Amino acid sequence: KKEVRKVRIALASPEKIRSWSYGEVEKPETINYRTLKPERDGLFDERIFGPIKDYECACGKYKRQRFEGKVCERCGVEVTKSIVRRYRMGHIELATPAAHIWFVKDVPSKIG
Amino acid sequence: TSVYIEDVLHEFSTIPGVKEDVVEIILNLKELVVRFLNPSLQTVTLLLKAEG
Amino acid sequence: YRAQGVKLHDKHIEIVVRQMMKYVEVTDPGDSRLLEGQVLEKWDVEALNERLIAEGK
Amino acid sequence: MEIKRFGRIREVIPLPPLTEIQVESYRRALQADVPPEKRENVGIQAAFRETFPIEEEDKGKGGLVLDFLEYRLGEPPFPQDECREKDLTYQAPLYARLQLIHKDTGLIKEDEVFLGHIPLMTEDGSFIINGADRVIVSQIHRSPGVYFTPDPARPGRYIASIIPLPKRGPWIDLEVEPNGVVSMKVNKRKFPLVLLLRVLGYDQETLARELGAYGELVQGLMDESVFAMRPEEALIRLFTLLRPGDPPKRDKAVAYVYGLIADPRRYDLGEAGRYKAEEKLGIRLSGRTLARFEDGEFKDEVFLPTLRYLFALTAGVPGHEVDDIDHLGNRRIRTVGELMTDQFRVGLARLARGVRERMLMGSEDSLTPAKLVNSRPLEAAIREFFSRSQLSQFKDETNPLSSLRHKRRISALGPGGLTRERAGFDVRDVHRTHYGRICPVETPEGANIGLITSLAAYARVDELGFIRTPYRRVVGGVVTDEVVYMTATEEDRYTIAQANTPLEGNRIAAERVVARRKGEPVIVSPEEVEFMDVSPKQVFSVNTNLIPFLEHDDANRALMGSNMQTQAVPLIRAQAPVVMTGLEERVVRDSLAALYAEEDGEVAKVDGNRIVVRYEDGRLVEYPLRRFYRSNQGTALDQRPRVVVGQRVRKGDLLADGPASENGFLALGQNVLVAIMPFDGYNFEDAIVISEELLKRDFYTSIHIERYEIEARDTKLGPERITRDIPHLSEAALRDLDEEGVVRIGAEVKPGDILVGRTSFKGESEPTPEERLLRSIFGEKARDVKDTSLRVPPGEGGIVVRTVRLRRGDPGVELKPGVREVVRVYVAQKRKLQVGDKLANRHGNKGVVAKILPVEDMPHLPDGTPVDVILNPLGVPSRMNLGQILETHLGLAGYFLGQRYISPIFDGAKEPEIKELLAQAFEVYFGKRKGEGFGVDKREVEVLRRAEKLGLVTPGKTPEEQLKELFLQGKVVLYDGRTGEPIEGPIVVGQMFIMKLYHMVEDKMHARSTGPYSLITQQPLGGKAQFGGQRFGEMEVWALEAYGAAHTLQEMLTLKSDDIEGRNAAYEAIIKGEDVPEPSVPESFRVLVKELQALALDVQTLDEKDNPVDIFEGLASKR
Amino acid sequence: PEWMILEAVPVLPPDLRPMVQVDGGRFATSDLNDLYRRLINRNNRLKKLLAQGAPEIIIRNEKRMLQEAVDALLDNGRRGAPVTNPGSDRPLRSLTDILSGKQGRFRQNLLGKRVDYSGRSVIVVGPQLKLHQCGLPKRMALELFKPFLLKKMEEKGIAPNVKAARRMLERQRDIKDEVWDALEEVIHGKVVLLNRAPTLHRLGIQAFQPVLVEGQSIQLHPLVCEAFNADFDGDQMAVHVPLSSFAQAEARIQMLSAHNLLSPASGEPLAKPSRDIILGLYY
Amino acid sequence: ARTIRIPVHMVETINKLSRTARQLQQELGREPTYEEIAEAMGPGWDAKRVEETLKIAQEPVSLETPIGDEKDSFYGDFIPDEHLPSPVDAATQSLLSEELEKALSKLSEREAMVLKLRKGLIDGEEVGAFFGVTRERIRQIENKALRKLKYHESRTRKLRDFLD
Amino acid sequence: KISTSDPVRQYL
Ligand SMILES: CO[C@H]1/C=C/O[C@@]2(C)Oc3c(C)c(O)c4c(c3C2=O)C2=NC3(CCN(CC(C)C)CC3)NC2=C(NC(=O)/C(C)=C\C=C\[C@H](C)[C@H](O)[C@@H](C)[C@@H](O)[C@@H](C)[C@H](OC(C)=O)[C@@H]1C)C4=O
Ligand SMILES: [Mg+2]
Ligand SMILES: [Mg+2]
Ligand SMILES: [Mg+2]
Ligand SMILES: [Mg+2]
Ligand SMILES: [Mg+2]
Ligand SMILES: [Mg+2]
Ligand SMILES: [Mg+2]
Ligand SMILES: [Mg+2]
Ligand SMILES: [Mg+2]
Ligand SMILES: [Mg+2]
Ligand SMILES: [Mg+2]
Ligand SMILES: [Mg+2]
Ligand SMILES: [Mg+2]
Ligand SMILES: [Mg+2]
Ligand SMILES: [Mg+2]
Ligand SMILES: [Mg+2]
Ligand SMILES: [Mg+2]
Ligand SMILES: [Mg+2]
Ligand SMILES: [Mg+2]
Ligand SMILES: [Mg+2]
Ligand SMILES: [Mg+2]
Ligand SMILES: [Mg+2]
Ligand SMILES: [Mg+2]
Ligand SMILES: [Mg+2]
Ligand SMILES: [Mg+2]
Ligand SMILES: [Mg+2]
Ligand SMILES: [Mg+2]
Ligand SMILES: [Mg+2]
Ligand SMILES: [Mg+2]
Ligand SMILES: [Mg+2]
Ligand SMILES: [Mg+2]
Ligand SMILES: [Mg+2]
Ligand SMILES: [Mg+2]
Ligand SMILES: [Mg+2]
Ligand SMILES: [Mg+2]
Ligand SMILES: [Mg+2]
Ligand SMILES: [Mg+2]
Ligand SMILES: [Mg+2]
Ligand SMILES: [Mg+2]
Ligand SMILES: [Mg+2]
Ligand SMILES: [Mg+2]
Ligand SMILES: [Mg+2]
Ligand SMILES: [Mg+2]
Ligand SMILES: [Mg+2]
Ligand SMILES: [Mg+2]
Ligand SMILES: [Mg+2]
Ligand SMILES: [Mg+2]
Ligand SMILES: [Mg+2]
Ligand SMILES: [Mg+2]
Ligand SMILES: [Mg+2]
Ligand SMILES: [Mg+2]
Ligand SMILES: [Mg+2]
Ligand SMILES: [Mg+2]
Ligand SMILES: [Mg+2]
Ligand SMILES: [Mg+2]
Ligand SMILES: [Mg+2]
Ligand SMILES: [Mg+2]
Ligand SMILES: [Mg+2]
Ligand SMILES: [Mg+2]
Ligand SMILES: [Mg+2]
Ligand SMILES: [Mg+2]
Ligand SMILES: [Mg+2]
Ligand SMILES: [Mg+2]
Ligand SMILES: [Mg+2]
Ligand SMILES: [Mg+2]
Ligand SMILES: [Mg+2]
Ligand SMILES: [Mg+2]
Ligand SMILES: [Mg+2]
Ligand SMILES: [Mg+2]
Ligand SMILES: [Mg+2]
Ligand SMILES: [Mg+2]
Ligand SMILES: [Mg+2]
Ligand SMILES: [Mg+2]
Ligand SMILES: [Mg+2]
Ligand SMILES: [Mg+2]
Ligand SMILES: [Mg+2]
Ligand SMILES: [Mg+2]
Ligand SMILES: [Mg+2]
Ligand SMILES: [Mg+2]
Ligand SMILES: [Mg+2]
Ligand SMILES: [Mg+2]
Ligand SMILES: [Mg+2]
Ligand SMILES: [Mg+2]
Ligand SMILES: [Mg+2]
Ligand SMILES: [Mg+2]
Ligand SMILES: [Mg+2]
Ligand SMILES: [Mg+2]
Ligand SMILES: [Mg+2]
Ligand SMILES: [Mg+2]
Ligand SMILES: [Mg+2]
Ligand SMILES: [Mg+2]
Ligand SMILES: [Mg+2]
Ligand SMILES: [Mg+2]
Ligand SMILES: [Mg+2]
Ligand SMILES: [Mg+2]
Ligand SMILES: [Mg+2]
Ligand SMILES: [Mg+2]
Ligand SMILES: [Mg+2]
Ligand SMILES: [Mg+2]
Ligand SMILES: [Mg+2]
Ligand SMILES: [Mg+2]
Ligand SMILES: [Mg+2]
Ligand SMILES: [Mg+2]
Ligand SMILES: [Mg+2]
Ligand SMILES: [Mg+2]
Ligand SMILES: [Mg+2]
Ligand SMILES: [Mg+2]
Ligand SMILES: [Mg+2]
Ligand SMILES: [Mg+2]
Ligand SMILES: [Mg+2]
Ligand SMILES: [Mg+2]
Ligand SMILES: [Mg+2]
Ligand SMILES: [Mg+2]
Ligand SMILES: [Mg+2]
Ligand SMILES: [Mg+2]
Ligand SMILES: [Mg+2]
Ligand SMILES: [Mg+2]
Ligand SMILES: [Mg+2]
Ligand SMILES: [Mg+2]
Ligand SMILES: [Mg+2]
Ligand SMILES: [Mg+2]
Ligand SMILES: [Mg+2]
Ligand SMILES: [Mg+2]
Ligand SMILES: [Mg+2]
Ligand SMILES: [Mg+2]
Ligand SMILES: [Mg+2]
Ligand SMILES: [Mg+2]
Ligand SMILES: [Mg+2]
Ligand SMILES: [Mg+2]
Ligand SMILES: [Mg+2]
Ligand SMILES: [Zn+2]
């Protein structure tokens, strides 16, 4: 509603990593041929990132706009088109940490 | 104003036994000068058929 | 340019060159350490309020 | 009509076979027409021998010897036209004889193995790879030799370079930095240039004294004596200097590599590399390159002479040892043959690679056929070169001329290994040696300039790609008709003179006559003139040679003229220039436009499709004529018979004319009478005014043909059927869809008509809930299929002339996978000249039609004949091509004298000769005027008044006499036409030839309202039928930035291209006549933020007071 | 500063790393996904390696790979360069290569985007035209001002509704001469922008009132042929449309040709009589 | 190993297919039409099966790949989009919904809403479509209201021009 | 530096 007057880049807190995220991609399962649908919890899962179809849900319990802001009882899908499927974030939970090479290998090692 | 060869469908065709191509002939026709004598003749269809 | 027929007003070159000198260097700190290169007017900001509104020159 | 040709320089030798460059190279490349008995063993046979004797000895059991006997390829799978009708690559089959030996009793010979289908050449010189005729363009680079160039940064002294191509194979350099080191580098690191000589056998004493007694630098050679005192040990010591941590013992293994076989090149033992040697440095070749493996003790007649010349080049004048790289004697050319033979050998190695593996895999002796050979490599390799090489291009058949040059064009870029993208200005410039070897006008215009240029007229690739230009001999003050094709290098050793030198025959005629020693203009004496230029034509290319008075036109704009012809489109009505140079005939003939008579005889039948001639030998042959064929770029190629029934033909006379020939003469565009004055603004910067009268006659009209194609694909949702069935609305649109499915031949198709129908399925996997209700409401039982039918793309269509459909039981065609069936629709259309079109004379005046005037009021001459086109004068001073103004003058003469002429390149017509013909013209013009009964106008006299006051007519002479004067000047009186009054001041007019230029696909104005969008980037994208948006570049952004165009710029960044939600509400708003809404955030922005979030970074927009605000409208908050 | 260390790797959206059906059944996915899988597999194999029992050498070995992986998605090439299997020795575009790259994100965020209401055709001198206006092909105007026309169709009897007005124009032979009269009415006082090949200065884009004309070419005024370095040997000019009443307001107020007569460079006119006019006026 | 997972059986399946294509390349000089592969493979192998397996065998392609003159071309800017309503469609749903909504109001909410909701709101059952009132009143008002609606819409032609 | 060598050396 208010004009965007200032942009700001700031470091990511691991708790902010998770704040922007939905679900944890925990398996290397793209899409399985038989059904061009998202495999298991994997990279494309509909819970984690979002449903791939307009105002409609995945199973179809609720399908039009009257209830546009609510989620499905047996399965989770709140809707407006797939743009959500292209804007949502998921996150992987690393075992034992690793570091950003963006901060480790810049000429002045910001960490060194 | 118009031409109809009997076995020819489009303007870019060639007729067997006929050196000239449809386009060359329709061209030669534009060269043709006719003269009718009275208003009663608005559109006259001239006919011609020759063989061998 | 003159030598090539072109006749553009100085103004323009000025606007440009000015920005080549929007920044300076430091040797007598207050808020941030000395060797730093920063925007000229941004220091005219600091010095201005540091000697006029808040004391301690 | 009669022909008068002006210049007299006896053209001593006819021009060479224009395509020999392409034809002969592929001839020597693949010597298949002659038995393996015939001696030319370069190319294929050579590449074969090069990698055939595969010696595989020990690691387990070996002693393998696969040997080559004879190479034979003979029966083409299919023929030319069938290769174009069907998608086919015309290639000849090849299987050579092979016999593998054994260390055990037995040698199995498996005769044939057909690996590699190698393309063939058309008799013209072009190929047929996949459907489209293709061409292999020649290249240029550093011919494998050795040179000495000045050192990089230190002004001091220069260093030596040994150049061995293929890539694999060392690159040596010799440099001396005296404080204590000398440098010889193969891969990179340096070492003493002597440790090597020692290895070979040159000892400190014999070396230093014989080689450099005269060269004090000998001291640096005998310096590190401690190592120079042990011979064969120096061999192991250098081994040691290389670095892996290798076994000291390896008897004569690595020394071999820089010895005889691989790395040093295996080209012609005697002239290939040994030419660069005996003339530049050293004297002999003890085998191809520094080579020997007979006693273990190597011989190097090349390692010492390179230093020998370095001590020599550094110490005085043995000769002057400085190599100008760009000397063509150094700069080699690659004829087609070489380009193919290389890929053929690359494939041979790939083949010989896999075969070695199978010398171990096959159990016992029966291993000759399949055990050793697999055709997978050679196929892929060679196939990759003719279809994917950056060198093989679509034929340039805009018109034979264009398609011809395209076969004789040479390029820089290519293999990547040679001159790539970076280096430029030294190569790009027209080097001195480029004389008669490369055109200086020809090359393109742009970042890619001078690197790609077509050779000259008499230029020919001798034995190894070295353009030798012809220069005739002149012993003493005597000139000969004998000619020597000289290498770039040798040309410098002589004093050469130009062809313009007044000649009485063998006698030079002027004491101080021009010659040019070595790239330097020098006024020499008749007694010094050793050699003379062969021809004014050899200096340039074919494409250029076609220009009338090249002589008077700025080389810069003459280029434009040369490239303009390459874009000439064939007109149904073709005409040759009123003034030609002299090669029009030769172009059409040497190109394969017109059909010539083999031997003398009479004509039997003269069909529109065939001319069966009867030779006097008692034979008669049917000569088909490519009625109407599709040129790669969509220009008509028809052969119109010019001979009547029963006609005795001379050997080599035109039976039919090519796409653009009038009478065996090249004919593009059409000579048109032209006034050269200003009109309102219709001809302002470079605009051309045209007389409607040019359209009345089918003058500038050209036939086009685009080839729309659609496929019946197999979707998992259900095959896409191709049927007359177009699911949703009318039969009106089904009319011309006569054949069930396909469109009927001869039907006029406008944009938006169905060319072909097809039916695919509605959704991805599921039906439609809302569309379920609607179908049910008026007709449930509704074909759930989708209209995906080839339609006429905006722009244009004509009348369908041919159609092709390939269904299920394929005859001998290649249908891609998934592809159920294909349907081609050839459409044709007449292109009458119009205001959007661009015409241009051979000189360079380029320009567009801005107004087609009614013959009613354009400039008309005294006798009712009016001008067709009015060219602006102003376009002539700035540019410098008076040649056009010269043409129009000779033209005016040809108009009234009813004759065409031939003005050679620089020898042609002369200003006095033209004034002479103009004089003859004045009588036909005004002579008939005298007798027909009338004299001179008030107008004619009035313009004379103003003309004398001007200074064009001698005051005091009679108007009759005055007009003669004024006519001779090339101008005549012209009346307005609109007012009938005269145009104060004489104006020139005349017969200038003008061609019409081909309309590129871009021409078709691309206007897009709304359309597709890219998947990942959300910016507008076109393709098939939706035009695709225009690019708004930074340079354009700033333009708006500079203005106060705030919103107009936002729009361009939001509503129009990336604001997903914006453009939607945008359209709809417009639809309801709503003043467009205020922009939402651009997807560029959102895509960014997220890509940025993808990386640790957090980009959050903020408020008035530093607080959040939201770009991602409601999709980022969670759940 | 405790955040520079990574223990939670944000994953880029899905539709932004597509998986698409191409041809025959070919698919197409953003290189990012091969990299994502890299990390996930490693991360998982790590967990299961810790759980199963843990021989030191092997756990580090993995943790190494893991690290490397975490680099890959973020930025490839800073340390070695990951490759899709034998086919293309190509750096899988890293999120970095996304933002910067040969042709990356902020990068092509400035090279250009494609406008929705654009057009482009060959130009031709328009001598009678006044600086004020420009000749625009009706054929082009139609598509350009389609939506503006549609609605205008409905306001008149030519069409019942939008969708109707659309199908009414989907084919060329179907246009009643009443439509031209509608478009010619829609364009009344609106103006468009014309661009030239290199837009070197602000006058590289100027606004004029369109005077609809036949054919393919675009009629341009002679006087402004000097502002755009555009001669007529085939130079083509694009054309854009001001949609907001605001954009139109600015466009025709402060961007219209006949208003910007003197150059921003010199106080010298740019509406100087070019070549033919002088020649006339001189003689 | 693969982006799009493939069970172990399909894997071996693919190896056997490959190996078989190998022994077939051995003598024909003709990369086997999917006829040979079926035969040589065994019991239930047919053309549709081999064309299918090798279609799955092709790994994907890099959405980011150098295209045309590799100068600077990236494969993903060229694929269009399907779910997203190109302007034309947003305008569609505007008039369609406004006009469908106008008709829906000036009517009987007994069988019109039934078939409006049963068809346009949840999923695609005459009997199970109407609340308490049986089939006879369903077909009665369905077909009589659906035709009065269509025939007056025939008068004031608004819907005729098939929005689809 | 380069990852294979180090582990190879590591367990070897
Ligand atoms: C081997 O096939 C392609 C290789 C590309 O790769 C590159 C990197 O290697 C090249 C090599 C080795 C070349 O020798 C040329 C070019 C390129 C490349 O770019 C050219 N490139 C351009 C320069 C500017 N671009 C515009 C770009 C910036 C958007 C257009 C082409 N002109 C080019 C030429 N022209 C001319 O000489 C001139 C002055 C006129 C001839 C025109 C006719 C009409 C053509 O000959 C036509 C029949 C056809 O052959 C081409 C269109 C062909 O395309 C196909 C599909 O066949 C390419 C040559 C070249 O001789
Ligand atoms: Mg906001
Ligand atoms: Mg408010
Ligand atoms: Mg974090
Ligand atoms: Mg997740
Ligand atoms: Mg199955
Ligand atoms: Mg789950
Ligand atoms: Mg819900
Ligand atoms: Mg869900
Ligand atoms: Mg949603
Ligand atoms: Mg986990
Ligand atoms: Mg018949
Ligand atoms: Mg025919
Ligand atoms: Mg005619
Ligand atoms: Mg009459
Ligand atoms: Mg009358
Ligand atoms: Mg009467
Ligand atoms: Mg009859
Ligand atoms: Mg200041
Ligand atoms: Mg303050
Ligand atoms: Mg103060
Ligand atoms: Mg204060
Ligand atoms: Mg105070
Ligand atoms: Mg005579
Ligand atoms: Mg005579
Ligand atoms: Mg002559
Ligand atoms: Mg001669
Ligand atoms: Mg051969
Ligand atoms: Mg060889
Ligand atoms: Mg041949
Ligand atoms: Mg030096
Ligand atoms: Mg060599
Ligand atoms: Mg080699
Ligand atoms: Mg050294
Ligand atoms: Mg000597
Ligand atoms: Mg010394
Ligand atoms: Mg010894
Ligand atoms: Mg080593
Ligand atoms: Mg020799
Ligand atoms: Mg010699
Ligand atoms: Mg010896
Ligand atoms: Mg000498
Ligand atoms: Mg010298
Ligand atoms: Mg035995
Ligand atoms: Mg190199
Ligand atoms: Mg560089
Ligand atoms: Mg450099
Ligand atoms: Mg230089
Ligand atoms: Mg010279
Ligand atoms: Mg060229
Ligand atoms: Mg002799
Ligand atoms: Mg000499
Ligand atoms: Mg004399
Ligand atoms: Mg004398
Ligand atoms: Mg010379
Ligand atoms: Mg030039
Ligand atoms: Mg012949
Ligand atoms: Mg012949
Ligand atoms: Mg006879
Ligand atoms: Mg004779
Ligand atoms: Mg005779
Ligand atoms: Mg004439
Ligand atoms: Mg398709
Ligand atoms: Mg109907
Ligand atoms: Mg449809
Ligand atoms: Mg349908
Ligand atoms: Mg349809
Ligand atoms: Mg079209
Ligand atoms: Mg045929
Ligand atoms: Mg294919
Ligand atoms: Mg197939
Ligand atoms: Mg089929
Ligand atoms: Mg036309
Ligand atoms: Mg007359
Ligand atoms: Mg005459
Ligand atoms: Mg001549
Ligand atoms: Mg005379
Ligand atoms: Mg007479
Ligand atoms: Mg008379
Ligand atoms: Mg008389
Ligand atoms: Mg005067
Ligand atoms: Mg007198
Ligand atoms: Mg007189
Ligand atoms: Mg259009
Ligand atoms: Mg369009
Ligand atoms: Mg659309
Ligand atoms: Mg909304
Ligand atoms: Mg909006
Ligand atoms: Mg409104
Ligand atoms: Mg409002
Ligand atoms: Mg908003
Ligand atoms: Mg961020
Ligand atoms: Mg860290
Ligand atoms: Mg498919
Ligand atoms: Mg991987
Ligand atoms: Mg340990
Ligand atoms: Mg350890
Ligand atoms: Mg790497
Ligand atoms: Mg790697
Ligand atoms: Mg790899
Ligand atoms: Mg991979
Ligand atoms: Mg690997
Ligand atoms: Mg990089
Ligand atoms: Mg980068
Ligand atoms: Mg006017
Ligand atoms: Mg006008
Ligand atoms: Mg209709
Ligand atoms: Mg119309
Ligand atoms: Mg009206
Ligand atoms: Mg018209
Ligand atoms: Mg052009
Ligand atoms: Mg342009
Ligand atoms: Mg507005
Ligand atoms: Mg000027
Ligand atoms: Mg396989
Ligand atoms: Mg096996
Ligand atoms: Mg395969
Ligand atoms: Mg491409
Ligand atoms: Mg869309
Ligand atoms: Mg409403
Ligand atoms: Mg109502
Ligand atoms: Mg109610
Ligand atoms: Mg009611
Ligand atoms: Mg009501
Ligand atoms: Mg209902
Ligand atoms: Mg319901
Ligand atoms: Mg259900
Ligand atoms: Mg109930
Ligand atoms: Mg009833
Ligand atoms: Mg009843
Ligand atoms: Mg009723
Ligand atoms: Zn659900």
Side-chain angles (χ1 to χ4, degrees), chain C residues 1-4 8 12-13 18-19 21-23 25 28 32-33 35-36 39 41 44 46-51 53 57:
Chain C
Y1 288 48
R2 282 161 170 177
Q4 256 217 186
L8 97 94
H12 308 286
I13 322 191
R18 193 195 178 204
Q19 290 271 292
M21 322 210 72
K22 145 179 168 210
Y23 327 71
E25 165 84 50
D28 202 321
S32 284
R33 260 49 197 168
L35 296 172
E36 268 189 352
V39 182
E41 211 289 332
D44 298 319
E46 221 287 327
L48 241 169
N49 291 59
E50 184 178 51
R51 210 233 60 257
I53 315 180
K57 182 163 129 287

Side-chain angles (χ1 to χ4, degrees), chain A residues 2 4-12 16 19-22 78 83-84 86-89 100 102, chain D residues 1015 1018 1061 1083 1086 1090 1093 1096-1104 1106 1109 1115-1119:
Chain A
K2 46 275 152 192
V4 194
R5 64 150 69 279
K6 331 180 172 193
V7 175
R8 145 207 159 100
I9 303 185
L11 249 188
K16 200 185 291 106
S19 167
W20 315 318
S21 193
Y22 297 71
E78 174 217 307
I83 48 170
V84 264
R86 25 148 46 192
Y87 292 27
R88 270 97 202 270
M89 298 268 328
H100 227 254
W102 253 33
Chain D
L1015 182 55
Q1018 215 41 44
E1061 293 193 21
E1083 275 293 58
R1086 300 177 197 165
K1090 275 305 190 201
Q1093 293 227 310
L1097 300 308
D1098 115 58
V1099 192
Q1100 163 61 195
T1101 58
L1102 269 80
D1103 224 17
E1104 285 82 50
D1106 323 318
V1109 174
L1115 311 75
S1117 310
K1118 31 196 202 293
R1119 307 311 194 188

Side-chain angles (χ1 to χ4, degrees), chain D residues 174 182 192-225 227-231 234 300 302-311:
Chain D
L174 322 171
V182 203
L193 297 38
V194 198
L195 150 63
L196 299 93
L197 285 192
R198 238 299 161 180
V199 146
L200 312 145
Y202 280 142
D203 46 64
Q204 306 240 301
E205 54 113 299
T206 195
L207 211 166
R209 273 96 252 199
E210 286 198 79
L211 121 146
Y214 74 81
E216 67 300 74
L217 309 177
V218 130
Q219 254 164 38
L221 102 82
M222 46 188 265
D223 236 331
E224 294 194 281
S225 190
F227 324 114
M229 275 31 253
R230 49 207 160 181
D300 63 296
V302 65
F303 229 157
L304 102 122
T306 64
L307 197 57
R308 203 172 44 66
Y309 256 73
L310 205 40
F311 290 4

